[PDB]
Amino acid sequence: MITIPYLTAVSTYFSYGLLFAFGQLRDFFRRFIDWWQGYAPICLGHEDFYIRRLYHRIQDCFERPISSAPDAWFDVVERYSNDNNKTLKRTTKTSRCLNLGSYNYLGFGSFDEYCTPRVIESLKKFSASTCSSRVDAGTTSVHAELEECVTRFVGKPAAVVFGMGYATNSAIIPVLIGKGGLIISDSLNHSSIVNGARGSGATIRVFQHNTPSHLERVLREQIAEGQPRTHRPWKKIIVVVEGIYSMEGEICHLPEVVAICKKYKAYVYLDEAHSIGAIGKTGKGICELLGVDTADVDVMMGTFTKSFGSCGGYIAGSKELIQYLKHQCPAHLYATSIPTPSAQQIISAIKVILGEDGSNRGAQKLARIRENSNFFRAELQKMGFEVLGDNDSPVMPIMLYNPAKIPAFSRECLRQKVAVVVVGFPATPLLLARARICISASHSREDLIRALKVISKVGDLSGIKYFPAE
Amino acid sequence: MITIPYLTAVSTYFSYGLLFAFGQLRDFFRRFIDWWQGYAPICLGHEDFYIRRLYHRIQDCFERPISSAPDAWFDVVERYSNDNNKTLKRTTKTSRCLNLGSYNYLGFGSFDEYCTPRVIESLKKFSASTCSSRVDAGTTSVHAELEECVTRFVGKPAAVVFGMGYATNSAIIPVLIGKGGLIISDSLNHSSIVNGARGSGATIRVFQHNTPSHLERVLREQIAEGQPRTHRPWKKIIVVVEGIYSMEGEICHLPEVVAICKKYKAYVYLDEAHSIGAIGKTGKGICELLGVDTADVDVMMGTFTKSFGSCGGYIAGSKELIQYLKHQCPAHLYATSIPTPSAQQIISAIKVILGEDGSNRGAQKLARIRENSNFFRAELQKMGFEVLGDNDSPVMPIMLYNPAKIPAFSRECLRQKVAVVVVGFPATPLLLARARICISASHSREDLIRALKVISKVGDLSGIKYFPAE
């Protein structure tokens, strides 16, 4: 699924083994110096080896504090050590870098003159948020008006909105499935989905990432073998897939997945976290870009953090599914309602996207998010880099493959006034370290042109042009 | 289940091996002399080895033709060879032996003055039997009156009567169970029951003869493992047992079997072939002797050949079972009805047994069948023989254990005017050859006394007094 140059797959294992060897050696001279209030230690000796022997070496590439709105250009605060690199502290000095590590695709995480004036007015009339849950006193009028805009937008009959995009997967999967069920998940699913599956009693299998000929062969075996020990019938089967598989940048093969789930009478659980304002000619997600009937999928989970510039989540489906969840979902019963100015800013963003604001800049954003991604991705391939994903996706990871290139590609770019994101080993597979580039609809062409020459010059030093240029 | 003297288990295998060795040698000198119309042979070379090398040596102990009614005393025809023992032919000379190899328990296979005059009258008014089946023109009035006497006698709501006791098991088991079902049979079941189970598509397991602690352990495994390859659920389970296990003479442990079949929701199929006029204070069978509610068993098969002195069979059960069988049983639809004088002789025998004939000799038979069996069996044990069965059973096999004692115990007894039955290897297990003694209610005490001294003198020569006398 990823083409790896053979000579680089060898100098990566060597680079990791050298780190392992020096780390064990150094940790062996700490265990004999600890000779100099009775409870067990907070953490054992060797459960955080790669946290203190690999992460602390490059800890200045993460948790960079900014002091400006998440815009195309922000200010980055500078940090010193003051005690030989153990606890970084922040100065007063700042910079002015190009934002390429945020998520605001449509450029809503800013001050725009249709949403912020309405949200400020919906603040001084409702005071932040209610202190009760939604079934007691936290269902304001704004919370009832917003659950209609989401149903109109997404397309399904009814929807529920929560206040966290991570609790939208750990507090719902236990409700729909329980013990005796099955969950054929995709390999590269978020942590929230797997934690939600663990919170119930269901069994989890995994089919190969983004290929249906392997999804069929797993369903056949699992229905022909029943429960793992007492070969009862499987009470249910649910298949979980994602719209755009981030950190791989690929659009899912939805038409070929739904067709196989219908045949074996399994259910489908879609996850449009990255693809609900980005892809599509109207912004309706993958079910519109790929031309699939929205009633073939049973549940559709989403998130407003990335595109609409406001926290939250939702679930949409048949009108009895929503009635069941509103009566038996712990996140709906026990948790405080989503704040009011954080719901007005979703209402007034869906109005802009649908063009009901009077102006017509709801289509300029949708066109400029595409004419920027198709340009950046095309230009990176011509210089010989290795970028993944298709042509219609806001994310494009660049593969690095070497643990030592992670602090080299980031420190140079920050020094030349460009900010990016890099991902290491403990989170990713060992061999696949990458950098993630996020392109928004607020970047101008003059910025992408200037940022491509900064990247092309840094990529010569590290030698990450694995493919041949022209 | 049978105590075998060790020194006799060794001279039996030696006796059989010597027969095997001489047989192979002799058959090897026939295959080279056959040198002196194109179709394949009727029978291969070596599928009837024990028919021509073991049975032909003692073929004069079987198929003895008699020329008198099956009474306490009959006439046995004498046979010569005339061509060096290849084809026995019958003479005109006869004998007068003591009948100990028939089956008429209650002494109905004779000329008694309440049944024969009625049967002769029901003959000259109905001419043998109808030439049609029962669903077209073979349901005479006598056939409708007889199916009421059987329901009154047996006790269950409805009953069907057939014309053969062997077709009463091969044409019904296919109807009740089919493919996907299970049949836990007892080891020592008749050939008809196993053939009937083979005629359907059901699977057959076997539990250990007359022990319930092994019946439970088979049901547990078979319900915990499902179908043998595709672990579906078992569609049904039926348990087949017999009232009195002939050729072992034991009464079944019915109360401990029904209790375990209720627990696992299996069905029960009883087989009262040997125990429907013999045991019981009224002659109602094992369900009366052992005190078990007759509604705990689902199907009850029987036979009129042994006790009532007339061919036939029956099945009794719930009024919808009979309605289903009368509409979907091949033996009821395609086969000629049971003859009329052979049904009148069952009606007029059940009337005698129930005491509705005016006289009271329906209880004299039931008492004299018991005071004769309890005497004969008690006297045989005191002389040191090995007899099986309980105290309430008309059959008592005497074990011989040696293939050469089969023609020795029979030829002597016939010479001293006593007729018995012996059973060999191809039919029985190898080690267990026996003689079967049948005691009726028509034998007098003077006959049993005289027959016991003939047996006690023959048993000295062959040395079949394995147990110690007093």
A331's tokens: 């996140």
Strand partners, A203: A182
Nearest CA in chain B to A227: B231
State how far the Cα of A326 lies from the Cα of A329, in Å rounded to an integer. Answer: 6
Q: Would an 8 Å CB–CB cutoff place A231 in contact with chain B? A: yes
Partners of A226 on chain B (C-beta within 8 Å) are 231
Distance between CA atoms of A155 and A149, rounded to whole angstroms?
10
CB pairs under 8 A between A and B: 5
Task: Decide: A334 and A134 in contact? Cβ < 8 Å.
Answer: no
- A395-399/A434-438 β-pairing: antiparallel
Element (H, E) at B183: strand B182-186
List chain B residues with CB under 8 Å of A231.
226, 231
Asked if B5 reaches chain A (Cβ–Cβ under 8 Å), the answer is no
CB A337 within 8 A of CB A139: yes
Q: Rounded to an integer, what distance in angstroms lies between the CA atom of residue A332 and that of residue A335?
A: 6
Beta-bridge mates of residue A422: A435
Q: Which residues of A touch B226 (CB under 8 A)?
A: 231
Q: List, in sequence order, every residue forming a beta bridge with A396; answer none if it has no partner.
A: A437
Resolution of the experimentally solved model in angstroms: 3.2
Q: Which of A201, A154, A159, A143 is nearest to A176 (CA)?
A: A201
Pick among A229, A231, A232 to test the B interface (most B CBs inside 10 A): A231
Q: Report CA torsion sign: A330, A332, A333, A338.
A: positive
Q: What are phi and psi of B39, to 5 degrees?
A: -70, 160
CA distance B236 to chain A (A): 17
Q: What is the token pair recorded at A223?
A: 């229905």
What string of H, E and C letters represents the secondary structure of chain A?
CCCCCHHHHHHHHHHHHHHHHHHHHHHHCCCCCCCCCCCCCCCCCCCCHHHHHHHHHHHHHCCCCECCCCCCEECEEEEECCCCCCCCEEEEEECCEEECCCCCCCCCCCCCCCCHHHHHHHHCCCCCCCCCECCCCCCCHHHHHHHHHHHHHHCCCEEEEECCCCHHHHCCHHHHCCCCCEEEEECCCCHHHHHHHHHCCCEEEEECCCCHHHHHHHHHHHHHHCCCCCCCCCCCEEEECCCEECCCCEECCHHHHHHHHHHCCCEEEEEECCCCCCCCCCCCCHHHHCCCCHHHCCEEEEECCCCCCCCCEEEEECHHHHHHHHHHCHHHHCCECCCCHHHHHHHHHHHHHCCCCCCCHHHHHHHHHHHHHHHHHHHHHHCCCCECCCCCCCEEEEECCCCCHHHHHHHHHHHCCEECEEECCCCCCCCCCEEEEECCCCCCHHHHHHHHHHHHHHHHHHCCCCCCCC
Hey, is B299 helix, strand or coil?
A: strand
Closest approach of A199 to chain B, Cα-based (Å): 30
* Chain A CB within 8 Å of residue B229 CB: no
d(CA A77, CA A89): 10
Tokens (6 digits) for A340 = 């009011």
Characterize the bridge pairing of strands B250-251 and B244-245.
antiparallel
Number of helical H runs and strand E runs in chain B: 16, 17
Q: Name chain A contacts of B231, Cβ cutoff 8 Å.
A: 226, 231
A226 touches chain B (CB under 8 A): yes
Q: Is residue B244 within 8 Å of B274, Cβ to Cβ?
A: yes
Q: Which residues contact A179 (CB under 8 A, 6 or more apart)?
A: A200, A201, A202
A-chain residues near B224 (CB < 8 A): 230
Q: Choose from B221, B230, B231, B234 for mutation: most chain A CBs within 10 A.
A: B231
B226 reaches A (C-beta below 8 A)? yes
The answer, for B231 touching chain A at a CB cutoff of 8 Å, is yes
As a three-state string, the secondary structure of B212-257 is HHHHHHHHHHHHHHCCCCCCCCCCCEEEECCCEECCCCEECCHHHH
Gyration radius (Cα) of chain B, Å: 24
Nearest CA in chain B to A224: B230
- At the topology level, CATH places domain B115-354 in Aspartate Aminotransferase; domain 2 (3.40.640)
A179 inside 8 A of chain B by CB:
no
Q: How many CB atoms lie within 10 A of CB A304?
A: 26
Write out the two tokens for A250.
């690929």
Looking at the complex, report in whole angstroms how far the Cα of residue A225 sits from the nearest Cα belonging to chain B. Answer: 8
Single out the residue of A193, A177, A199, A154 nearest to residue A318, CA to CA. Answer: A154
Cα of B467 vs its chain's centroid, Å: 27
List CB contacts (< 8 A) between A224 and chain B. Answer: 230
Residue B197 gets which letter from DSSP?
A: H
Method: cryo-EM
Chain A residue with the nearest C-alpha to that of B231: A231
Classify B270 as helix, strand or coil.
strand
Question: What residues contact residue A295 under an 8 Å CB cut-off, 6+ apart?
Answer: A156
* Rounded Cα–Cα distance for residues A116 and B267 (Å): 77
Integer Cα distance of B15 and B4 in angstroms:
16
